[PDB]
Structures are given as C-alpha cells and as structure tokens.
C-alpha cells in the first residue's frame, strides 16, 4: 500500500519538496540514481535467486545481473557434491599431478568464468544460488517489490536528491542520513530473519 | 539505465552544474581527468583481462594497458607451471650454478620485460592474467561498461571538475568527497562478490 | 590523450587561471620547476633503465643522469656474480691481504666512481640497472611519458606555480596539495604493481 | 549395531569433529591410515586363517596377506 506505483512516487516526491518545476526526466534519473545506490547495499531475501546453469567449455558464465555469489552445487548425476574455491595454483597442481577425485569437487573464479577442476563435457548442469540486482524502476516497470516492501527508502532518497540538483545541503545531508538509516534498518531487520543461521555461513576452510 | 552514452552524461551535468559558459572541449577534458583519476584505483573483476603472450629474447614484453599482474602460467607444452617470483641475485646464483628443473618456473622483472629463468626458445607461449586501464570515453567511444555500471562515479567526478574550473573550491570538496564514497562503495561491493575467496590471496611464503 | 603536448598543457593553464597576461618564459619556468619538483620523487617502471657500461681504470664512472642504483651485475666474461657493497675499511684489508677471489665480487662508492674489489683491466663490462630524470619537457621536446600517462600531474603543478607567482596562498595550498595526492597515487599504483614483489626488497642481510 | 557401516562412520565424524570442509578423498585417507596402523597391531580370531599350502621345489610359498605364522 501507501505508494503503489512509480507515478504515485514522483507525486509524491514534487507535493514533498514543492518543486512543481522538475521535468519527468529529472525525476526518472533521480529514481535510477537512488536505485543504482541500492544495489551496492542491499543482500535480501527478496534479492536471493537460485537457477540451473550449463556448464560448457570447461566453465560457467556468470549471470549478467550477477552481484554476489552464495552456492554451487553440482548435479546428483556428476557427483552431487558442494564445489569448494581454491587458487590458481592449487588448480594448477591438481591438473599437473593428476588429482583424478570421484567428482566435481573444487572451482576457482578465471575472468568471467567459473573453472571446475575435474574437468566435465559440454552440458554438466549446476545448481547456483547467488543475488542479483533490483528491478528498475521507471514508466516500462512501474511496480517493485522493494517499492511495495518499503516505500519511505525510495522517497526519502529521491527527496535527498532533489535537495542535491537545488544546490542545497543542509537538508541534502539530512536526508541522506534519513535515507541511510532506512538502509540499515532494512538490512538490520533481514540479517536477524532467523537467529540460527547468524551463527553459521562464516567458517569455511580454516585449518 | 540513467546515463547511457557521453551525450547524456554531459547534458546531465551541465544541468546540475546549471552553468552554460562550458564547451565540448571542456566535458571532454573533465571526463578524460576523471578516467584517469578512476584508471589509478579501481581493480574490479571487469578490468580483468587473461590472454596468450609469445616469450622472445628469453622474455616477456609488458603490455601497454598493464596496471597490475595477477598471475602468468606456463603452457602444458613448456611445463605448465604457475611461475615464481624471485630476487635478481637468486637468478644470477641460478643461472651461474646451472639449477635446470624441469620447467620453466620462475621469473623476475627486468626494465620493462619478465625474464625466466630455465631460458627458452622464442616462441614459447605464456598464459598471464592481469588488469589493464577503464576504455576511453569520448566521442568515438561513446559507451563503457564503467558508465553503464555505475553512472554516479562519472556525474559526480564531471561535476568536481567543474566547480574546479570555476575557480571554486567548497563545492568541490563537497563533490570530490561524494565521488570517492561511490568509488569506495564500488570497490568495496567488489572485494565481497565471493566471500569464501576473501581468505585467500592475503597471505603467501612467509618462513 | 586528454593533453598531448606542452602547448596544449600552457592553453589549459591559461584558461584554468584566466591569466592571459603570462609569457611563455613564465609559463616554461613552472613547468620546469614542476618537473624539477618531480624528480626528487619518482620511482617508477617508466623511470628505470638498464645499460652496458665500460670499466676504467678500475672503477665504472656513475651516468650523469643517476638517481639511483637498483643493481650492478658483471660480464660472464669476468665471473658473471652480482656485486655487493663493502665499506672503505673493507676494501683496504681486502687490497692489504690479497684477498683474490675467483671473479668479480664486491664494490664500494668513492667520489664520483663505483671501484670494484678484484681489479680488473680496462675495458671490463658491466650491466648497470638504476633510475634516471624524467625527460625535460620544453619546446624542443613536445611530449614525454610523464604527459601522456597522467596529465593532471602536470596540470596541478602548473597550477600551483601560477597561483605562488600571483602570490595567493589559500589557492597555492590546495593546489600543491592536489598535486602532492596525485604523486602519492601514482607512486602507489606502481608499488602494488606485483604483489609477490613487495615482500622482497626488503629484509635483505641482517645478521 | 552401533556403527554399521562406512557411511555412517563418516556421518559421524563429521557431526563429532564439526568440519563441514573434509571431502570423500579425505575421509577414505583417514580410514585407509587407521586401518594399516591396525594392521601392525591386531592378532585376534577373526585375523587368523588356516589353510592346505602345497609344497614345491623343496620349499613352501609364503601367502601374499600373511602378517605372523
């Protein structure tokens, strides 16, 4: 509810600051300004995104949207096992001396590519779990799920940049502050989803 | 997404600037200066760059666009080995004491050019992976994937230029302090793309 | 590109400063003074140079342009070994108790000559690898390195000497500060250049 | 009972040791360690076999497996 839709925001955002000057496209690149923000800052549920992919060539591609990696997992049919990252030259080790293990166990990040070290024919599927970038918000896509989730994050931040193209900054920081503090409260409330799992997805290959 | 191509980048700031007195040569100028400044600090996984580089005179010519080395490994054919770094003295002992592995596997900076140390034909093909400068962006190279990224950088930056060119230095702290918190969020949102891969690459032959 | 030659460095700087009323004597006097400035702080894979020099009378004469020694390695032809320093007391209690080792070995800075330990006749050759001046950059000689991989460099010393000749000292401090952070930059990117180098260099010979 | 088979014995050192980082390769190295050092140790029952050896050439050939007479 409250904001439901992009032209419902720009509403608001001009009734707020009272500048009935600002033209659509002014407020559509605030809008993308205060998402492209977003997407360095926000890993949430709603943000999760598991898929098969191919793996061809020896490797995988990874995904265009592609913002942080949390999985991968081999197919039940190649081995069925969670890959594990080592470095170049442990890769380079295995391939020399002839590791030869039962499946696909170890992977490493080359360029763009993920390189799998028991090396698999063309058309292996995985199972990746990773996060993406949020939806754009614009006249071609006028509703979210971070709109409809919290809307105080997308007019707090359009009003902080409004008050940055004005040349104005006392309030220009205020609400960036606001609009942080909203970030963080959001972030805050995602980490503490579950008390369990805090705990754990930390300690990976210590010896 | 916001900005697209140069065009849009320098209407964008001449309207945030609101001044008119600045010519193309100048938003040339400005976005060329804030390349720069970017080519000197940024070390992401698009300015990765891995390819086939031929070994002549008992060497290796560095490319033109390098910036930083990740890695150089040797071809199967030579050996296939992930080569070592050592101390122009210890290649001398080397070379004086007739050492002969088996393959190629260390090497050392000399001027401008790797040399290796089990000496070997011209011809002899190297793997090296490293990161090179951000493309151009000018009117024949209208598009990067650094403004398609992240557009902020380059308002921002544009923008501290700018208010530097009209003899004003406050607005240009503020600018300049803007852009180096979107460079360091890019940065930062990059180094936790895998956590698993954080560990490593820290610490290596200490004895 | 940005800034290509030294005519167009002086129109930038001109326009930058506004003040159309400085000669070219004046201009040619800061960059000169901007390169002087540099000189005393660079080291850089573009600044090094590695050179066949002749022995003789028993010393290598130090090149006009030095500023500092990296390594001096002998010919095959004389033992192949790279030198090591010893002091004056050394030297003498060798050349007292006739040492005689197999090639050449040690060497020791008197004046303005390198002398080498086990004297060897006139003509013997050694490769020096040390550091030189940046190019001068002039009428006479358009473009150099330094220009054309950092022109901001260039363009805030400029800066900075026109705004000391004004006699301004708040402007004065920012620019020099400017310039002293892009130098800072520079020379940081070229010391991270080889990661699995910074760790020698360092803790050599202790005892 | 108890422990069945190599499975659950895998199973189990994984829950007591709290190490979700050790492969299968690892594993069978660690199994494959324990029981030669056993097998310098253990002169039980179920060790010990007797079987009909034919003598040729004047001499009799020592079993491939044999461990202690």
Same mark, same amino acid.
Request: hydrophobic share 40%; net charge negative.
């Given at each position: ?46 943000? &999760? !995104? /598991?898929?098969? *992919?191919?793996?061809?060539? %020896?490797?995988?591609? +990874?995904? &265009? !949207? /592609?913002?942080? *990696?949390?999985?991968?997992? %081999?197919?039940?049919? +190649? ?129």
């Amino acid at each position: 509810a409250t904001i439901n839709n992009v032209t419902d925001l720009a509403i608001a955002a001009i009734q707020w600051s009272d500048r009935q000057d600002l033209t659509q496209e002014l407020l559509m690149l605030f809008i993308g300004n205060t998402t492209d923000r977003l997407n360095r800052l926000l890993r949430v549920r709603e943000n &999760e !995104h /598991f898929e098969t *992919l191919m793996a061809f060539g %020896g490797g995988i591609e +990874i995904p &265009e !949207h /592609f913002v942080a *990696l949390r999985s991968i997992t %081999g197919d039940s049919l +190649i081995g069925g096992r969670t890959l594990q990252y080592i470095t170049q030259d442990i890769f380079t080790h295995y391939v020399n001396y002839n590791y030869q293990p039962q499946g696909v166990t170890y992977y490493t990040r080359l360029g763009n590519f993920w390189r799998v070290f028991p090396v698999v024919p063309d058309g292996a599927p995985f199972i990746v779990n990773y996060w993406t970038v949020l939806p754009e918000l614009s006249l071609a896509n006028p509703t979210t799920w971070a709109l409809t989730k919290y809307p105080q994050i997308y007019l707090y931040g359009v009003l902080e940049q409004i008050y940055l193209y004005t040349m104005d900054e006392a309030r220009s920081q205020f609400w960036g502050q606001k609009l942080e503090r909203a970030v963080m409260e959001l972030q805050n409330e995602e980490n503490a989803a579950d008390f369990a799992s805090t705990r754990l997805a930390i300690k990976d290959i210590e010896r």
